[PDB]
């Protein structure tokens, strides 16, 4: 057997464990047989090329399936009334009523209604027909092919890069900051100014005419003249109808602030100046490190020099340069943490400040986008801590990190874990106590005795941004403040109009229910951090297992001795923290969806009165909004929600199936499989057929992973079906 | 839908022929010595 060709130990396994473990360790290149550092880095480079090609192919598929089977040209004409089509349905298991019920969007065939918001994004950036959608899909197919060829080429001999090229920190930082961040942002600003804004103003700009259609009537003469403010004159009127010239301006770079009054999205000229400014700032950032010409900073010198002279950080950041450059898991943990923070930021800032025209009125799309990117954020943060734990097991050299910041983290890990435990117990005890207190006192008919804390700190922050609801009269909500006078000529009118109109999700009003749910969120974040940090810092060893680093990042246990050592590895801490991550994204998305559903209904007082106790969440959010979802099919008929009605139940099934792998453990299943092996060997007309691999029970770690996978898939599919079908049933 | 024959041609192929051939060849690959 030579399927796991990268593992001789796995290939000699006589059982079904060989296939599973070869599948599960296939992309763990550092553990493979005879892996060198150079080969590892080259394989990673080509794999990164392949993932880039996968992303481009997926985006081209979205564009193509829309240009072929969608209703984009119909949706452009009437954006607030036409339901956007994702793709067509051809399922031979449908009956005729299911064919009728999925025939929506103004077309004559069964379709799925898109919730990804690609219509609003593509319409805002200037696409108008199906032809340019198809052309974009072709271009992304070509780009994916180019990146596949590059991945093949940069593995060919005399093109395989050396380890000195891969560990060139300064050159990669300079090029990725100035070019990949800066020039890409500048080019996107160019696309907005040259294409997107004219198509927003009813003027077609394509490859056939963009060299003769000036973005601004004065041309580049104000830019080369230094009279840049000419580009800010004559902005779009508040009577502008998007995609037409009626009420259109001529400005290309403004700082108006707030929203377009019709699209309820940010001004495209504001977005163009934003991406231009971001490009300039990032290109300035990308000239910081020394690559070939004497000028620039050395990263090693910056790290070694920043030791505080009071000695509280010990040796400071000495040795962090080599530790980070030599460890791909340190790099992966930093990258995943920063990405997770920024996709959380994307989720918050995109509902609060939408940039795509008419997407604030697509309630299903807003709910799906927020939920999607927040679940992605939870996954990324768990991955950051997991790969940090892997760095501590595999790549942390203590002798190279003497009295370092990393060494001092390891030296006060007990204080860190104990104070995280204290703050988690503090938050949980009192948050659950307030919720249960409110539940009991409302059940006994006395809601006036509830403990309702006004969130005055965040309300004060809202007033500092200009919200006049709470009467705090500070910073931008004070008409005499220096902060008010400073920004009054540039962005303060549009921002103040957008923040003080209760027609958007810009700094939504908050009460005691908001206070309680943010403190529950604080509990869940601190507890997930406790599990992950305790896993990373005890990954090398504990009092129960002082030689844990000899056993690797993942292993089942250390046996029933010493009291019992179930789930002692750092992988098991990842496994335990996955449930807490699912719990916290569940709480966050529940809060977002219930607040927005009550606001969109014009019934925000229902959230304000029911969110202070748990029975309000169970009854007025879960039970109340489940009714159109669970009636997608019934004994009287079916409608288009039926698929979500199926998927919901599907989720409730597979989640429960996960429980089987997490509660029942191995030896029971191994003895059952032994009885089954006897039965097959002793049954006539079936013992003519023989297995090639011996049937065994799943291993301990594998079963933990499989139960986690079924659990997580059930979690995601259940909530996705609920949120989409509930928002569709109430509003669409 | 333009080229309406393409779903009825490709969906049975992609959903039944592609996984059958992949499962057969992967079975042969993972079980051969």
């Amino acid at each position: 057997t030579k399927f796991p060709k990268f593992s001789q130990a796995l290939a000699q396994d006589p059982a079904t464990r060989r296939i599973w473990y070869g599948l599960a360790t296939a992309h763990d290149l550092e553990s493979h047989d005879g892996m060198t550092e150079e080969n590892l880095y080259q394989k990673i480079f080509a794999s990164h090329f392949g993932h880039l090609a996968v992303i481009f192919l997926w985006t081209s598929g979205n564009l193509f399936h829309l240009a072929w089977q969608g209703n984009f040209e119909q949706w452009v004409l009437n954006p607030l009334k036409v339901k956007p089509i994702a793709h067509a349905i051809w399922d031979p298991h449908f009956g005729q009523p299911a064919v009728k019920a999925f025939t929506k969007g103004g077309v004559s065939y069964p379709v799925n209604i898109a919730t990804s918001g690609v219509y609003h994004w593509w319409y805002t950036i200037g696409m108008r027909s199906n032809t340019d959608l198809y052309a974009g899909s072709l271009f992304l197919l070509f780009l994916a092919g180019v990146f596949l060829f590059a991945g093949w080429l940069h593995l060919q001999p005399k093109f395989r890069p050396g380890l000195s090229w891969f560990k060139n920190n300064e050159s990669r930082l300079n090029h990725h900051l100035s070019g990949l961040f800066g020039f890409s942002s500048l080019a996107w600003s160019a696309h907005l100014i040259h294409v997107a804004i004219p198509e927003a103003r009813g003027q077609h700009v394509g490859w056939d005419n963009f060299t003769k259609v000036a973005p601004h009537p004065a041309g580049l003469q104000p830019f080369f003249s230094g009279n840049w403010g000419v580009y800010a004159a004559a902005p779009d009127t508040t009577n502008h109808i998007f995609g037409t010239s009626e009420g259109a301006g001529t400005a290309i770079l403004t700082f108006l602030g707030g929203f377009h009054p019709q699209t309820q999205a940010l001004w495209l000229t504001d977005i163009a100046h934003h991406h231009l400014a971001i490009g300039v700032v990032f290109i300035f950032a990308g000239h910081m490190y020394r690559t070939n010409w004497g000028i620039g900073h050395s990263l090693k010198e910056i790290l070694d020099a920043h030791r505080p002279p009071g000695g509280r950080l010990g040796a400071g950041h000495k040795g962090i340069f080599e530790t980070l450059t030599n460890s791909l898991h340190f790099q992966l943990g930093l990258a995943l943490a920063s990405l997770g923070v920024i996709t959380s930021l994307v989720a918050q800032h995109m509902y609060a400040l939408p940039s795509y025209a008419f997407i604030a009125k697509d309630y299903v799309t807003q709910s799906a986008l927020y939920t999607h990117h927040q679940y992605i954020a939870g996954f990324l943060m768990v991955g950051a801590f997991a790969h940090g734990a892997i760095f501590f097991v595999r790549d942390y050299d203590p002798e190279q990190n003497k009295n370092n910041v990393l060494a001092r983290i390891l030296d006060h890990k007990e204080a860190i874990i104990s104070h995280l435990s204290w703050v988690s117990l503090f938050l949980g005890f009192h948050t659950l106590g307030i919720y249960v207190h409110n539940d009991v006192v409302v059940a006994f008919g006395t809601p006036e005795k509830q403990i309702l804390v006004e969130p005055v700190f965040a309300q004060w922050i809202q007033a500092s941004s200009g919200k006049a609801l709470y009467g705090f009269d500070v910073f931008l909500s004070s008409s005499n403040s220096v902060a008010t006078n400073a920004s009054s000529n540039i962005w303060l009118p549009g921002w103040l109009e957008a923040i003080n109109s209760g027609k958007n999700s810009l700094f939504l009003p908050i009460g005691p229910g908001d206070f309680l749910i943010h403190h529950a969120i604080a509990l869940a974040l601190h507890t997930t951090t406790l599990i992950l940090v305790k896993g990373a810092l005890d990954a090398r060893g504990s009092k129960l297992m002082p030689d844990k680093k000899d056993f690797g990042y993942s292993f089942p246990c250390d046996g029933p001795g010493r009291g019992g050592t179930c789930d002692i590895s750092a992988w098991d801490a990842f496994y335990l923290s996955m449930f807490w991550m699912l719990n916290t994204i569940g709480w966050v998305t529940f809060y977002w969806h219930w607040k927005h559903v009550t606001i969109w209904q014009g019934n925000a007082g229902q959230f304000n009165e029911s969110s202070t106790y748990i029975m309000g969440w169970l009854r007025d959010y879960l039970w109340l909004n489940s009714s159109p979802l669970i009636n997608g099919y019934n004994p009287f008929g079916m409608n288009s929600l039926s698929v979500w009605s199926w998927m919901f139940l599907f989720g409730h099934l597979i989640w429960a199936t996960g429980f089987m792998f997490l509660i029942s453990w191995r030896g029971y299943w191994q003895e059952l499989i032994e009885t089954l092996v006897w039965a097959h060997e002793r049954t006539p007309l079936a013992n003519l057929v023989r297995w090639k691999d011996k049937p065994v029970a799943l291993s301990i770690v594998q079963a933990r992973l499989v139960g986690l996978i079924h659990f997580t898939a059930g979690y995601i599919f259940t909530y996705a079906a609920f949120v989409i079908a509930s928002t569709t049933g109430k509003f669409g | 839908m333009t080229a309406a024959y393409l779903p009825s041609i490709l969906v049975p192929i992609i959903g039944l022929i592609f996984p059958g051939l992949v499962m057969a060849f992967a079975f042969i690959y993972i079980e051969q010595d």
């Binding site: 090329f49 392949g50 090609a53 192919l57 072709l138 596949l148 991945g151 593995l155 | 333009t2």
Partner: peptide
């Protein structure tokens, strides 16, 4: 709207990408 020829052109480009992906997969497999 999109014609049959345009879909065929996209299919040809996808087949080229399939050949390149198979070559990259064989190169990564050593």
């Amino acid at each position: 709207m999109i014609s049959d020829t345009q879909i065929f052109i996209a299919l040809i480009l996808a087949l080229v990408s399939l050949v390149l992906a198979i070559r990259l997969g064989r190169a990564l497999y050593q």
